[PDB]
């Protein structure tokens, strides 16, 4: 299964110029485009190698759409001020995420469109792609306007059509990276904390996609509740990192095993500290 997701952020900044509009696009865990209204010459720009082959009609077209969206979102920030009776002096944020999920055969699984105003749910397109769930009185005003203007049908047309079509195209063009899991490189480090205790840290580096499981066992007993597990983090080269650590009594180190589960690994992986 695969996904395409776009994330738009619009942020007002009174006495600091017009609102900033930033948009990013992902296929699965890979960012492929960006637009930033604060760039020197604002344009949709490539962020993955497999999108670079797109020609001028693509980039000019996306740039045109981004500029128009920035203007619309700037107006939407103004409308929100009215709905919520807010002052022109405060900074506010609209966030929108939308896109489509497809199955292994390329058929649409689900469409998405949901948003937040100042970090709180605002309005979301329901799974039926025909109705809206509105979080508050303001979003209810929007819901009615959108029912009147047949917005759901237009969005449905995108999600079922163009969204799926281009996702399939991106998946084929970037198949060597997007459809080839990168297994983690793994190792265990050992760090004495005192003469009586030591940290064992199990590393997973350079993996893709981001989903992974990293656990410690003592004598084959799971130690999840005594494990420090850091949030999965970007390496900076389109792959990910994670580690899991336990503090163990000195002398118990060889009883501890680290277990790694990842799509890029054929079978569950088990490691120990090798002195």
């Amino acid at each position: 299964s695969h996904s395409m997701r776009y994330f738009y952020t619009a942020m007002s900044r009174p006495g600091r110029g017009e609102p900033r509009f930033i948009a990013v696009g992902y296929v699965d865990d890979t960012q492929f485009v960006r637009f930033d209204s604060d760039a020197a010459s604002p344009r949709m720009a490539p962020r993955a190698p497999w999108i670079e082959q797109e020609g001028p009609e693509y980039w000019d077209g996306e740039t045109r759409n981004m500029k128009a969206s920035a203007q619309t979102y700037r107006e939407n920030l103004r409308i929100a001020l009215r709905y919520y009776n807010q002052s022109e002096a405060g900074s506010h944020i609209i966030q929108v995420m939308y896109g489509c999920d497809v199955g292994p055969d390329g058929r649409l699984l689900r469409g998405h469109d949901q948003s937040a105003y100042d970090g709180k749910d605002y309005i979301a397109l329901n799974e039926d792609l025909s109705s809206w769930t509105a979080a508050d009185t303001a979003a209810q005003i929007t819901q009615r306007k959108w029912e009147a203007a047949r917005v759901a049908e237009q969005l449905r047309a995108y999600l079922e059509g163009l969204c799926v079509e281009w996702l399939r195209r991106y998946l084929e063009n970037g198949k060597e990276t997007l459809q080839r899991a990168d297994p983690p490189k793994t190792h265990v480090t050992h760090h004495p904390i005192s003469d009586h205790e030591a940290t064992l840290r199990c590393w997973a580096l350079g993996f893709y996609p981001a989903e992974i499981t990293l656990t410690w066992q003592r004598d084959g007993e799971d130690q999840t509740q005594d494990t420090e597990l850091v949030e999965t983090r970007p390496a900076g080269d389109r792959t990910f990192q994670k580690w899991a650590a336990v503090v163990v009594p000195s002398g118990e180190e060889q009883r501890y095993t680290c277990h790694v589960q990842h799509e890029g690994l054929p079978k569950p992986l088990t490691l120990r500290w090798e002195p």
């Binding site: 759409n65 619309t72 409308i79 306007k145 917005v151 969005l155 281009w166």
Partner: peptide, 10 residues
């Protein structure tokens, strides 16, 4: 490619 909806005001 991004959605191409015309002037979607809230």
């Amino acid at each position: 490619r991004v959605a191409q909806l015309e002037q979607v005001y809230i």
